[PDB]
């Protein structure tokens, strides 16, 4: 499994610094282009910068030129940005990316992506959230949810029963209140019948503010 | 633009060179076949590092001293299939530095 | 920069279903372009590079073409799990661009929503909030109007709603709106009401709760 894995985002005001990292498995890292790929949330796919191989030869758009630096440490198999004089519309997920499968014919084309890690750019303070039970209450189909209420940033995850439920589960994407803060529900929808017997918990971890709450879910 | 020409059967060459920092100092350079890409080459036919070639195959081959940063190539026994624009890629250090050459081979 | 501009943005496409879509160059791009396939939350996944070459693993179903200033990208035999945005990126010229992007939805039979209604818990309305929230569960099209409804009083700006991306095997939405008032304004009112048309109802189903009631 070749594999990357993105660290280092988060909440950075403007005009400051932030490095992020990848981890690359599962391949020989030291003989690949890697590239940086960006993602504002809701919009499109920018480029960033790459790196050689060797990790002496360094690429970047027009954008990032003179805050942005690519560098690799080989014998670490890992990737770094650091991003400086970062501004509002930085705000963005950061991939680290590789043509691997493609190097032989089209370098750059990226068959390998991280999972990605969220860089804020702004001035707002870190707030966790509340988690708040979305309980049942009324045939056959009972929903239940959790409201994560007032956080800040991005991203919060929720998952039900410690991942044990998936099946009829909608995570909904984050709305900014007017109050700048973020708010999300995250349902699911399960037999009625159930409701006695299977005992619901949401498990949201809002990592920025190093919050886990665990909310049992009671009709 | 400037056409390199070679019978169906010979072999080709297409001149790249590129300016050691200092002898013994290599940069990785690669050739492949269509236009110098963003990265590197597309369709490598040939790549080297900072020590010696790393990758080859028995038609595509560097006939000069590469060692003193002649990398022109030489293509055994040219079909028209061996047409094209090949890319010559010195992977310079530093920020944005590549030396791409494109060669038009034309095979009569 | 040479840019890449997709056609349609939109598009909406019954499984098995030919749809095609274009990506066109603002400079001679060669055979150099990159076709990716994003889900909701995930990376792109690579479908297609140098214009034409799939990647393992990609159903034959997928195919590129085109060269120089204009590409296609055509799924044949379309599938629930096509749902997705999709970009082009050529590797020409720096700096690497993308398209816009290209969102395909899957067309599909109507299907009504199940409503539920919550009441703010007790626990939100001790910090002095009141959050109503009506799930619109597992409905097509997307379209949708929820209309929130305190004593019978029409509201407006105090209510937001969030949508699944569509689902990859029934292709279907969710739709959260949640109502936000004080827990002075929540105390005020008796009956709140979330009104949902859908195209696959024949008439608005309200679901509404009194409040303080088991
Ligand atoms: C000198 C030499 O190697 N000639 C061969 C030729 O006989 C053969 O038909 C061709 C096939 O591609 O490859 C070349």
């Known amino acids: ?219 | 633009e400037v056409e390199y020409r070679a019978e169906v059967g010979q072999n080709a060459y297409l001149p790249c060179f590129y300016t050691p920092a200092a002898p013994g100092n290599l940069v990785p350079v690669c050739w492949g076949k269509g236009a110098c890409p963003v990265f590197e080459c597309g369709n490598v036919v040939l790549r080297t590092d900072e020590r010696d070639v790393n990758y080859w195959t028995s038609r595509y081959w560097l006939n000069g001293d590469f060692r003193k940063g002649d990398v022109s190539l030489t293509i055994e026994n040219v079909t028209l299939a061996d047409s094209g624009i090949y890319c010559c890629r010195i992977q310079i250090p530093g920020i944005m530095n590549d030396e791409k050459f494109n060669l038009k081979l034309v095979i009569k | 920069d040479i840019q890449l501009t997709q056609s349609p943005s939109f598009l909406s496409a019954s499984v098995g279903d030919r749809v095609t879509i274009t990506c066109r160059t603002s400079q001679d791009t060669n055979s150099y372009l990159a076709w990716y396939q994003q889900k909701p939350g995930k990376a792109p996944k690579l479908l297609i590079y140098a214009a034409s070459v799939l990647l393992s693993g990609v159903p034959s179903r997928f195919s590129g073409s085109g060269s120089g200033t204009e590409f296609t990208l055509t799924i044949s035999s379309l599938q629930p799990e096509d749902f997705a945005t999709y970009y082009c990126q050529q590797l020409a010229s720096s700096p690497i661009t993308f398209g816009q992007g290209t969102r395909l939805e899957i067309k599909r039979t109507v299907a009504a929503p199940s409503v539920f209604i919550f009441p703010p818990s007790d626990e939100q309305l001790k910090s002095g909030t009141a959050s109503v929230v009506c799930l619109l569960n597992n409905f097509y099209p997307r379209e949708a109007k929820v209309q929130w409804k305190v004593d019978n009083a029409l509201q407006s700006g105090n209510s937001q709603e969030s949508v699944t991306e569509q689902d990859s095997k029934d292709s279907t939405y969710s739709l959260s709106s949640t109502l936000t008032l004080s827990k002075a304004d929540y105390e005020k009112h008796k009956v709140y009401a979330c009104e949902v048309t859908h195209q696959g109802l024949s008439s608005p189903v309200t679901k509404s709760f009194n409040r303080g009631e088991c």
């Open chain 1, 1 to 219: 499994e070749v594999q990357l894995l993105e660290s280092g985002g988060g909440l950075v005001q403007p005009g400051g610094s932030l490095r992020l990292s990848c981890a690359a498995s599962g391949f020989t890292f030291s003989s690949y282009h890697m590239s940086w790929v960006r993602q504002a949330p809701g919009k499109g796919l920018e480029w960033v910068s790459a790196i050689s191989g060797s990790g002496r030869s360094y690429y970047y758009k027009d954008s990032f030129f003179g805050r942005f630096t690519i560098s690799r440490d080989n014998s670490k198999n890992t990737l770094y940005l650091q991003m400086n004089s970062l501004r509002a519309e930085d705000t963005a997920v950061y991939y680290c990316a590789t043509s691997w499968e493609t190097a032989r014919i089209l370098p750059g084309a990226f068959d390998i992506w991280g999972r990605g890690t969220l860089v804020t750019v702004s001035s707002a303070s870190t707030k966790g959230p509340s988690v708040f039970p979305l309980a049942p209450s009324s045939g056959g189909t009972a929903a239940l949810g959790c409201l994560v209420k007032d956080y800040f940033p991005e991203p919060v995850t929720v998952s039900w029963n410690s991942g044990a439920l998936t099946s009829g589960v909608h995570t909904f994407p984050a709305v900014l209140q007017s109050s700048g803060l973020y708010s999300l529900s995250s349902v699911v929808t399960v037999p009625s019948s159930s409701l006695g017997t299977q005992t619901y918990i949401c498990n949201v971890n809002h990592k920025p503010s190093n919050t886990k709450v665990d909310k049992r879910v009671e009709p």
